[PDB]
Structure 1
């Protein structure tokens, strides 16, 4: 696994048997994680960070300014931990990890997993480490979906949540964007039904999926600032090169089967399913204090759906970041996100 090899040092917990909510049983299941700081003696100063679609558990690599003394992820006050999702190439069980029933990696045969599956197996790891109580869960985008699912363990185990730039269930809009991206992979002749050699990826498929995803992550004003025409009496011609560079970078560093496995998780996200008759009714069962962070310019997760979260979670506050960055704001405006999270954790 060249993806996992590329990472800084991390830990692996092995779960000998895990039942997915489908009923499919995974065996000898690795769960990768990275932690910072130290548990207090009550073992109740744990902060869980949930990562994004294509990142590893090493949150420091894209959120470096949220770590350290006086920052949100203050390793002098908290045990901070991030666990790699199932389906990911970065250490946890997925397409790139060894298949116990032949060992050969799972490849295209890695079972479907849900947001709820990840939350369940991640909690088993926290129980192994001796975590007694979680001070906060914080996650953006896909990680905000896990965050909302963590909340349902209840306020005695999970004290606070910070869902950022996210949704309560799959929407037709995001389903269509992500399926379009998968079809790019499916249509690449190198894909070979998922049977490709790991070093001969469907690179055109991955590249095109990235170009699309990148634009859905930005906004019109953000792209207009980056590329514009000269006054009538950074240039538009540069767009081509920018797109090719962004795409190639992603295609060299991610696995196609994993990209399929992980985006498919989006389609089964729904905090209400089996629990409540509607989204507002499921939200009402979230009893912890919540800080909901969003931007009006996010083109995938709307301002309105964050307002709906705020209306139905009884003890919630909505933080609207003033920015034109689009969905990518939680990384671009990391200082503002840091201050918001730190101020909420301090309360």
Structure 2
């Protein structure tokens, strides 16, 4: 697995048998993870960070300023852990990992849900001897896991910080990610998911990423970055290669089948399914203190759906980041997110 190979050092827990909620049984399942800091004697200073769609467990690489003394992820006070999701190319079981029935899983990797990841991740935490979680913190896909973690109850998960995220798959997002998968499906190199690993559907992947990358932006943000010279890169000419450069580097270092498997997780997401008759009723079952962090200008996860979260989670504070950035604000305004998270964790 060349994708996992490109990462820094990380741990792998192996679960010999895991039952997916579909009822499919995975065997001898790797779960990659990365932690920083040390558990206290009480084993109750654990902080779980849930990563984004395409990242690895190495949160430091896209959230570097959230780490350190007096920062949100304070390695002096907390044991901070991030576990890689099933379906990802970066160490946990997915299309890229070995199929214990021979050859990697490839196109045949079973469907997994947010709830599957949470269950398997809590198994790993149990093995590490974590007895209580001080907080779970997660953005985008991470915020969906974060919301799901909360259901363990306040006795195991003391606080949550869902960021830029939702309670359930929406038609809007389903459409954007389905569009992205279709770019891959239509790439003749895809061969139904049977492509050889060093001959990826690279155009499909690129295109999927250009689209995704733009949905992560706001109109003001791209307007500041690219604009025309006065009446009478940064110019509009430069848009072309900006779009190409980034999507190319990503297609060179991610797997098509994992992109499909990961985005499909979004379709399973619903915090209410099997639990409550509606989303507000399910949110009301979240008893922990919650800090909901959002931006007005997020084009994927709407301000209003966060306002809804804050309104139905009984002990919740809504934190609106003062920014014009759009969905990737939690990365572009990392310092503001850090302060908000740190302040919340300090009460």
TM bin (shorter chain): over 0.9
| 2:18 match: secondary structure | strand
Give the distance between the partners of 1:29 and 1:57, measured in 2 at CA.
16
Give the distance between the partners of 1:198 and 1:145, measured in 2 at CA.
30
How far 1:324 sits from its partner (Å)?
1.0
Name the residue aligned to 1:223. Answer: 222
Name the residue aligned to 1:142. Answer: 141
Give the distance between the partners of 1:337 and 1:178, measured in 2 at CA.
26
Number of equivalent positions: 346
How far 1:109 sits from its partner (Å)?
0.1
| Cα deviation code 1:127-185 (max 9, x no counterpart) | 00000000000000000000000000000000000000000000000000000000000
| Cα deviation code 1:217-263 (max 9, x no counterpart) | 00100000010000010111111111110110110110000000000
| Cα deviation code 1:188-229 (max 9, x no counterpart) | 000000000111000000000011001100010000001000
Give the distance between the partners of 2:225 and 2:246, measured in 1 at CA.
14
Give the distance between the partners of 2:343 and 2:177, measured in 1 at CA.
34
| 1:317 match: secondary structure | strand
Name the residue aligned to 1:290. Answer: 290
Give the distance between the partners of 2:78 and 2:297, measured in 1 at CA.
32
Give the distance between the partners of 2:134 and 2:153, measured in 1 at CA.
12
| 2:328 match: secondary structure | helix
- TM-score (normalised: structure 2): 0.99
How far 1:83 sits from its partner (Å)?
0.1
Give the distance between the partners of 1:315 and 1:12, measured in 2 at CA.
35
Give the distance between the partners of 1:6 and 1:245, measured in 2 at CA.
20
| Cα deviation code 1:56-104 (max 9, x no counterpart) | 00000000000000000000000000000000000000000000011x0
Give the distance between the partners of 1:294 and 1:95, measured in 2 at CA.
32
| Cα deviation code 1:258-299 (max 9, x no counterpart) | 000000000010000000000000000000000000000100
How far 1:125 sits from its partner (Å)?
0.2
Name the residue aligned to 1:161. Answer: 160
Give the distance between the partners of 1:215 and 1:8, measured in 2 at CA.
28
Give the distance between the partners of 1:344 and 1:246, measured in 2 at CA.
34
Name the residue aligned to 1:175. Answer: 174
Give the distance between the partners of 2:8 and 2:214, measured in 1 at CA.
29
| Cα deviation code 1:298-330 (max 9, x no counterpart) | 000000000000000000000000111100000
Give the distance between the partners of 1:201 and 1:288, measured in 2 at CA.
44
| Cα deviation code 1:41-67 (max 9, x no counterpart) | 000000000000000000000000000
Superposition map of 1:131-280 within 5 A: 131-233=130-232, 234-280=234-280
| 1:21 match: secondary structure | coil
Give the distance between the partners of 2:83 and 2:300, measured in 1 at CA.
25
Instruction: Name stretches of at least 5 consecutive residues in structure 2 with no aligned partner.
Output: none
Q: Structure 1: which 4+ aligned runs deviate by more than 6 Å?
A: none
| 1:327 match: secondary structure | coil
Give the distance between the partners of 1:247 and 1:8, measured in 2 at CA.
22
Name the residue aligned to 2:329. Answer: 329
Moved more, 244-253 or 155-164: 244-253
